[PDB]
Amino acid sequence: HLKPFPPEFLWGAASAAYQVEGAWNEDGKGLSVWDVFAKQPGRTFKGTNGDVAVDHYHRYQEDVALMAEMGLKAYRFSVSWSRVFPDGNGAVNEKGLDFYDRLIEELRNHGIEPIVTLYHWDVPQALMDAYGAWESRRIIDDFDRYAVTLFQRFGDRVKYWVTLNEQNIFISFGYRLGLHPPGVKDMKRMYEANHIANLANAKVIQSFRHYVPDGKIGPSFAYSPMYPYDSRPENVLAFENAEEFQNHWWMDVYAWGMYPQAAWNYLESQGLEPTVAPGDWELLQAAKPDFMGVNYYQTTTVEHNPPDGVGEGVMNTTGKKGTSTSSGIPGLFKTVRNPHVDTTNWDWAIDPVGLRIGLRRIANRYQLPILITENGLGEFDTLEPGDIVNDDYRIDYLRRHVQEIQRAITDGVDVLGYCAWSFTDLLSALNGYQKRYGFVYVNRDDESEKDLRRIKKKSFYWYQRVIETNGAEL
Amino acid sequence: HLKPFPPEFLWGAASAAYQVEGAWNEDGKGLSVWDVFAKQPGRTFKGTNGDVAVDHYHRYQEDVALMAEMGLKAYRFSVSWSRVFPDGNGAVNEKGLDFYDRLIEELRNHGIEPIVTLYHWDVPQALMDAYGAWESRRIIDDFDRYAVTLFQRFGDRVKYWVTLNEQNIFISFGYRLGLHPPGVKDMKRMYEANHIANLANAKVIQSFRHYVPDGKIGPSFAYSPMYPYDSRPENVLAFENAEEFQNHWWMDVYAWGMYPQAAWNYLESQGLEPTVAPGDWELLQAAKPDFMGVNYYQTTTVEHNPPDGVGEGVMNTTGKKGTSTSSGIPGLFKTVRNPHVDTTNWDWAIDPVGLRIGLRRIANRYQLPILITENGLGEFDTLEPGDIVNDDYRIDYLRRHVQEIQRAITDGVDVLGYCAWSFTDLLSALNGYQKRYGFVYVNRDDESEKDLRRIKKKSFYWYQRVIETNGAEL
Ligand SMILES: O=P(O)(O)OC[C@H]1O[C@@H](O)[C@H](O)[C@@H](O)[C@H]1O
């Protein structure tokens, strides 16, 4: 006897500003770090970038009309900081705020709840130039000024807010793997920038309690739950290390204001632990979120990794299956193909039960409500003549994950909503346009913008029926 | 680089009153539930009982002398409730208090730290007769009065106190499996008596803060960390359920004062959740321990168990390897032999890495210091000519486990000490005398009581050398 989805369950879809808006230099918008980075040769798939993306900036009315047709209860989007402060921390660009005001008014006029993401990796380039952006404590008050600007302008109309989207990704990709701006490969700098982002997160949550006393706020963590390969004790210990280093390192700080101790000591032993200032722990412990935001796509299985073992592996950014290779931390753990699940063409594991496990782990460890801020299937789509897209593979993926959400709710996890990535097709920062996630196909590819026309996929009508039945009919 | 064991690490050994003392009816001692239960035919191995045990009650001076020869830093023993209150409540028996006074003086006069366990399974039969012992809230104030009596008489000389030893064992065995007093097979009653035991533990810890303000106290949990069989999502989920149901169910209450929510929901859905009265949560959440006590012998590997699957299985009280079979809870998990570790003749997993994992899990989840109150190998010993007991198998087990403790300490776990089970051979209620745990052989078996003379085993001299080098030489 499964519990039903609660009556006000937030059935949503999501996007991010750099990935969907376009209009990169219009109406006073400044450069973001992604404007600059993506135009460096070799940084993005086929040199794709967000100059135009899918032009949501100009076409938001058509897109919101499609959301209304679907019956979306919630739409999660991010605000482009460089539209609001073109130089990051100077005078406000009113035309920038006005875009998001028009967007929010469009959502509310169709009965859709806005979910505002403050930060989706696009800090203005001017802050990188002035002081290195997230690597400097100066960003704490600059991010707070920006957050409070949005809180005051939109807090009367927006109840649900996300602070940092996938801090573990934009920090580790920007400072350990060098795949995001600023392109650094330095573990000491990574953990320093990470600590500053933790403090910025806490500061803005503190501010939120003053400026939006009846709102709900949380970070959105890129959560891949770890599995041991088998019951060999060394592999279970590898799993303990992996879960703590990859997941508790972030979520313990979000929930408890404390880093986990075994991980801290391993970094201390390598001279990698971040610099801690007086007041840091007090701020991190005082900023309790209303929920843990969860971006979930796949689990990760790990096994023992000797001290001279595997480090950085090969990442699949082309969609040729089976091209990724194991990665890990020497002495702690390394990843291994999970033989009991299938994978996508980008080698992401398809593990709906892993979402139930992840939701249970967060509830069991932190007792926090969860907002699923991202989940979806990135795959090639074929436009068939007559403007038909039969993405049964995407329906099957979403269906099985939504079913496991219902089992977690029945277990006692307080799930507040589910936001599918993505509403329309959009730019994947590192994979181009052909790794599509949308309910709505956009007619363009990596070589041509074509006409950017919106075409409803079969998954569009499937999710429409999920929402109409409140998830009773999947 | 391994860290050294800290300078004041408590190198110890342990026993339990009913298993070691004898003198079951001397100096006004009342009958305990074990006095009565072990005399019923078929309850214990070959009808062995603790009428004489190894007669430590009359030979404690000899046993403490052997401790001083070995160089024990600490000795963990339990106090017999029926020696102190033959009735459970009512008049204190001064000759009962006087025995533990003489014991504690003997330990202190040889520079050995006493660790007093308040309760090891032997509630006076009178309380079982009057109101069902642990199934009644009356036991909360009666246990408290007993504990406070011990705090007042010995608080000045005893710093380390253990409240309930293996609450999960004497509750589950006594009310689910029917193998311990009172021999019940009723899960509803088990969870009621468990809840009262939780309240009793909390009340005594609160009293402890008043009466022994400079002491350290905690429960000692029988911890078998759970492993998933493999990375099949359904088997990881079985591991989440097993770890929560078998371990978090107790340790979450000890550390946070809360039951885990999914396990609670499962029990409530079966009409098995305990009765909560006003003020239960407040008391349980106020009673933070100074440490988590850990009795570790083995890990458990689990796998998926369908709704129509395995329940209770066969236990090995014989010593014939391969007799035990799988057990579990239908729909949640069932146990499976771990193909990657060896096992004893009683089918217990030999998994020293499992101890490090369990220590890491407790530190990672609760951030508590750990006192390892029990660890040992139960095996057959042969007395060879020349008073030689070559228990190399026992040395091998202990050495590997101590080595993993050192790695846990190096990882950052705060391990306060290590109490091997047991100092002398003693009585196993369900396994008899031939499953020996001691550093010191005791001359008796299940048939012949002989003279009970003490003989130092090879492992006695090994551990003497461990303590002498503070663990540098294993
Ligand atoms: O585009 P990707 O890398 O395939 O992932 C799909 C999406 O989910 C997460 O990674 C991010 O929050 C988004 O920026 C987007 O990347």
From TrEMBL, chains A, B:
Beta-D-glucose 6-phosphate 2 binds at residues 19, 374, 421, 429, 431, 435, 437. The active site is at 374 (nucleophile). PROSITE patterns: GLYCOSYL_HYDROL_F1_1 (PS00572), GLYCOSYL_HYDROL_F1_2 (PS00653). GO terms for cellular component: cytosol. Beta-D-glucose 6-phosphate 1 binds at residues 19, 120, 166, 374, 421, 428-429, 431, 435, 437. One of its GO terms (biological process) is carbohydrate catabolic process. Gene3D superfamilies: Glycosidases. Pfam families: Glyco_hydro_1. It is an enzyme of class 3 (hydrolase). It comes from the Bacteria. This is Putative 6-phospho-beta-galactobiosidase. It comes from Geobacillus stearothermophilus.
